[PDB]
Amino acid sequence: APIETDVLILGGGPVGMALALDLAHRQVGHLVVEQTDGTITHPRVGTIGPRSMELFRRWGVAKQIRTAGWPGDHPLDAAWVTRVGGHEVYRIPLGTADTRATPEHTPEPDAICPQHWLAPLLAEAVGERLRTRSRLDSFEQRDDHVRATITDLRTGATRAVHARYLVACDGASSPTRKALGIDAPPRHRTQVFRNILFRAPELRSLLGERAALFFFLMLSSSLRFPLRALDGRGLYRLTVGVDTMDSFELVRRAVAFDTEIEVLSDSEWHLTHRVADSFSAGRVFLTGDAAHTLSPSGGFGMNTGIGSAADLGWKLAATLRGWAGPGLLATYEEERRPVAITSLEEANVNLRRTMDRELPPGLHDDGPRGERIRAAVAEKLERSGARREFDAPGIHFGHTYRSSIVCGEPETEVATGGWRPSARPGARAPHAWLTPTTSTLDLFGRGFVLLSFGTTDGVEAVTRAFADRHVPLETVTCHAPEIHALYERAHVLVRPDGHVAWRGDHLPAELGGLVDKVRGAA
Numbered sequence: 001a002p003i004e005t006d007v008l009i010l011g012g013g014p015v016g017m018a019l020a021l022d023l024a025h026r027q028v029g030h031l032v033v034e035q036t037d038g039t040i041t042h043p044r045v046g047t048i049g050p051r052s053m054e055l056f057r058r059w060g061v062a063k064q065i066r067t068a069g070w071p072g073d074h075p076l077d078a079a080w081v082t083r084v085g086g087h088e089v090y091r092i093p094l095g096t097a098d099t100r101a102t103p104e105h106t107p108e109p110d111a112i113c114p115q116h117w118l119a120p121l122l123a124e125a126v127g128e129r130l131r132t133r134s135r136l137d138s139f140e141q142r143d144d145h146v147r148a149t150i151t152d153l154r155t156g157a158t159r160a161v162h163a164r165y166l167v168a169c170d171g172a173s174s175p176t177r178k179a180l181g182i183d184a185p186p187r188h189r190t191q192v193f194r195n196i197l198f199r200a201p202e203l204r205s206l207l208g209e210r211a212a213l214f215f216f217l218m219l220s221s222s223l224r225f226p227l228r229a230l231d232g233r234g235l236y237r238l239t240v241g242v243d244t245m246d247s248f249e250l251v252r253r254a255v256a257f258d259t260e261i262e263v264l265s266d267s268e269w270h271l272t273h274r275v276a277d278s279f280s281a282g283r284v285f286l287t288g289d290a291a292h293t294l295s296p297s298g299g300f301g302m303n304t305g306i307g308s309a310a311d312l313g314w315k316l317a318a319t320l321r322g323w324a325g326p327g328l329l330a331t332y333e334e335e336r337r338p339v340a341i342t343s344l345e346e347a348n349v350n351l352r353r354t355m356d357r358e359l360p361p362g363l364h365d366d367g368p369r370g371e372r373i374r375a376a377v378a379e380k381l382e383r384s385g386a387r388r389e390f391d392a393p394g395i396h397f398g399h400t401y402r403s404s405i406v407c408g409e410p411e412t413e414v415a416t417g418g419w420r421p422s423a424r425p426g427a428r429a430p431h432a433w434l435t436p437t438t439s440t441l442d443l444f445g446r447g448f449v450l451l452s453f454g455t456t457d458g459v460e461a462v463t464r465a466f467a468d469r470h471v472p473l474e475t476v477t478c479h480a481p482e483i484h485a486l487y488e489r490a491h492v493l494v495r496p497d498g499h500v501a502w503r504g505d506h507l508p509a510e511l512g513g514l515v516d517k518v519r520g521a522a
């Protein structure tokens with residue numbers, strides 16, 4: 001008895017679960033298959049970006065993520081040091097969770113949540129629809145659905161699943177991308193690293209006021225990378241480059257204290273810059289790492305994935321419900337790929353900054369002699385814009401879609417200063433508190449939304465144009481002059497994904513035309 005569902009999600013990692021959460025919130029029947037048993041032994045992701053947090057706010061898991069265990073009094077600072085407990089060279093103070101100032105561009109700042117805490121949270125939200133220890137072996141595309149063979153790794157039995165759509169969130173080495181014959185050429189040189197996970201129970205006490213979330217080491221050529229405090233209560237991770245030495249000894253070399261150290265893992269990995277040439281073929285799609293990979297310098301990886309998952313989510317649901325034009329699905333690649341590429345190049349800039357930084361001779365000496373060399377280095381660090389690696393609002397919220405379903409404005413793209421909120425066509429509708437408890441972002445996520453800051457003339461006609469096409473629409477009349485200034489126009493049409501599709505002080509004459517354009521039937 002072949003099981004059938006609307007969407008088959010290949011991958012139980014961060015990105016596949018987010019996609020499951022989005023389909024769930026859109027009444028789309030779905031099923032997730034994860035080959036592993038779903039537990040985490042070696043945490044990869046630690047920082048949940050703000051944009052991801054906004055989507056989790058909508059899905060109702062943001063709060064549990066923040067109280068998952070990260071200490072509210074632990075420093076979020078990043079610091080360049082010769083060795084942990086050695087000599088400081090440059091620090092970027094970022095407060096603590098309970099201490100930093102409330103952000104103004106968003107309702108959900110970033111959070112610290114190591115993957116072994118995030119997985120249980122996500123599994124519980126996705127619930128019953130997640131199937132662990134299940135591996136997808138192959139898939140055959142038929143006329144109106146995809147047929148896949150799933151091996152139950154528990155009993156050894158194989159079952160078949162017929163779904164209208166097959167979404168592959170199977171990671172960087174996506175077997176699915178290969179079976180379809182799609183190539184994801186490296187845009188930059190591939191590198192190799194080792195990540196050592198360990199427990200150090202008294203390290204925090206010893207560091208006292210010098211405790212940090214990130215310790216960028218400037219010891220040797222292999223040790224010029226971050227040592228991260230994963231859970232703020234004993235767990236740390238040291239990344240080391242490889243162009244042989246014992247695990248424990250590498251950690252001893254990086255940590256200048258005689259304190260208890262317990263090595264747990266020593267995982268080798270490849271940092272790559274690979275984006276797929278195409279994000280789909282037939283009823284089979286690629287999302288997350290299977291579509292785009294980038295250097296972890298900046299922490300953009302999982303966020304760009306969750307972003308693409310949310311994009312595909314509303315477009316899949318629209319085609320399944322019937323109101324989507326035949327050309328809607330193809331905009332997933334049209335819109336997400338360019339974002340993947342630009343985010344990759346920005347991650348590379350951060351990477352090259354520490355790869356090309358030089359480690360002067362007497363950087364380790366004691367006394368004002370070497371202190372002068374450090375002051376020199378710290379100086380160059382400032383000018384190199386190192387802090388851009390730990391403060392990338394533009395990369396988090398500044399991507400603007402320039403596509404066939406977006407009525408873009410003339411204004412081209414040429415950075416002339418730090419990123420600022422914009423309600424321009426293609427961008428993420430900016431945040432503003434309507435009330436102490438409600439954000440403009442809380443109005444988006446379901447169907448199309450039309451914000452009117454002035455006269456509601458024409459709105460009635462907008463409603464009919466959408467109803468005529470069975471396209472879901474919600475009209476909100478807002479007064480707040482502050483929000484009007486931010487959005488700039490009197491009427492703003494926001495897509496189901498929170499991005500602007502059109503804006504103007506006067507609704508257009510051919511509303512049926514606008515409705516057809518924004519739905520992919522242009």
Ligand SMILES: Cc1cc2nc3c(=O)[nH]c(=O)nc-3n(C[C@H](O)[C@H](O)[C@H](O)COP(=O)(O)OP(=O)(O)OC[C@H]3O[C@@H](n4cnc5c(N)ncnc54)[C@H](O)[C@@H]3O)c2cc1C
Nearest residue numbers: 011013014015035046047135136170171288289301302303
């Ligand atoms: C050292 C390091 C640190 C990082 N830190 C961060 C960070 O702080 N923040 C951030 O945003 N990003 C971070 N990233 C990047 C981030 O980890 C990735 O972007 C993210 O994991 C991609 O998620 P994914 O769901 O697409 O795939 P993955 O997490 O790679 O998961 C793929 C899943 O597919 C499953 N699977 C594969 N094949 C099959 C099959 N045939 N059948 C069933 N299941 C299958 C796997 O078992 C796995 O669970 C980091 C990366 C590295 C290397």
Ligand SMILES: O=C(O)c1[nH]c(O)c2c1c1c3ccccc3[nH]c1c1[nH]c3ccccc3c12
Nearest residue numbers: 046047225226228239296297298299351389390
């Ligand atoms: O995600 C990580 O913790 C992580 N793992 C890693 O291996 C990294 C990083 C991060 C990171 C996380 C949030 C904000 C900024 C960041 N820069 C780097 C970062 N920069 C690097 C440069 C070289 C090798 C590894 C990393 C690396």
